[PDB]
Amino acid sequence: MNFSEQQLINWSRPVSTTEDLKCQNAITQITAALRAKFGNRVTIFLQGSYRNNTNVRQNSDVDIVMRYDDAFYPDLYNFDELKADTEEALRNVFTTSVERKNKCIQVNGNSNRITADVIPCFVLKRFSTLQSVEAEGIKFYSDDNKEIISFPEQHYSNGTEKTNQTYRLYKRMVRILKVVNYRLIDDGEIADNLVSSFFIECLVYNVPNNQFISGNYTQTLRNVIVKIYEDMKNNADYTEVNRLFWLFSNRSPRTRQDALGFMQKCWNYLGY
Template structure:
């Protein structure tokens, strides 16, 4: 264990909070302004990502904000049995007249009007540049997604609520950010508040590995690192960061990676060919680089 406990302790610290909170409240306020063209629509605005989950490190700048249309939704009925599928089909309504495209266009126009021409629509999210009081922010426009597990009637059904959006090249992406945050908080509490600082240690370690050319940028996204550690059993989160890192790496070295879940516990963490999972090659590259850096750094 070549990395000192002091360095790991420094890496465990949370990144800037005050300006990130101010950024979120300012943009959320703008999105909820009664003069916005979509003000009469049903929607919710909330944080996601590292700032929403308190796992942000100092090098992270953008604040991720979701605005989700709730008056319309996308459905996944693949888990319903034949009888429930028939009932769902009989009760399904007609085509919506206001959906993702209309909502995103109005949100983009309002953000440009509010914050100026520096606001730009990216492949996934709308970028809102920061200023002296605000950090840069990414606003993800989406619609509610329901993954049904049971459907007996409109009033008697069970489903997981997530979000759904389309990229500029029409790729559909479904995720479950609220379950991710809730499950990470449960894990944090169950590990006597060791989980989230340990995530920050690994994220800072990844950043140091990129700087030292142990790994290429983009191979180990923060979301997947967080999900990876979420799978590690609670007893591996020790009272020292050195022992925690060693325990976690040892457990991950010995696990079956195909059985790891994302922290939302509704997607697999590692699968090839899907836009919500880590591919196996990048996972193995990350693990090999983590082990090498851990064993040799500072010697």
């Protein structure tokens, strides 16, 4: 094929991480701005690629979640107000670097800190029929009125467990496929929203552990692509990484066809 084993290994490494000084600086500065307004009435934590350690680009933006949760985690109000107050707290400190977005408040970075997407949200509890239990996550509303729900803790823990069981290859394969995604987007071969990091992470998560071959990146990646591709042709019932909800649920607009087409473009780009 087109790329060597060593090239795949290189592509499998995390690039931006929470050890980076500019990431630490962003979290420190934004946390202080938020605490000045909200005190202990919020929990601050990370989600997305810095949390799951799946960044494949330099100086990537970090997703900082600000969960307003005084009612559930008290000290031992509608969403529109929360988001406006969050924007105000950030603008008081970062002034012109602050931009309101559909699903977050963006704080643009600078020479000494990465850009951050600050995600105000509330506690969310929902029953999972998959596990027949109530699950806790977060919820927020987009400016175009969508209810966005996330289970970042369960996503984090399940993905970490899987990579620990697959010779660390689960997340390494996610990272390789994210690299290929960005290359295909840059080349104009696929739309920039055909897949997402979350979608890729869920697809690879459903590949059985016995497909990940210790010390063989080329064959593992072949196994991953072939398995997802065949599963999509076969109408497979994939779960999200959180194992609480279905990947191809009627709440989600992404389809098995999106995954099938992406796998095909990856196969062709890699030259298997």
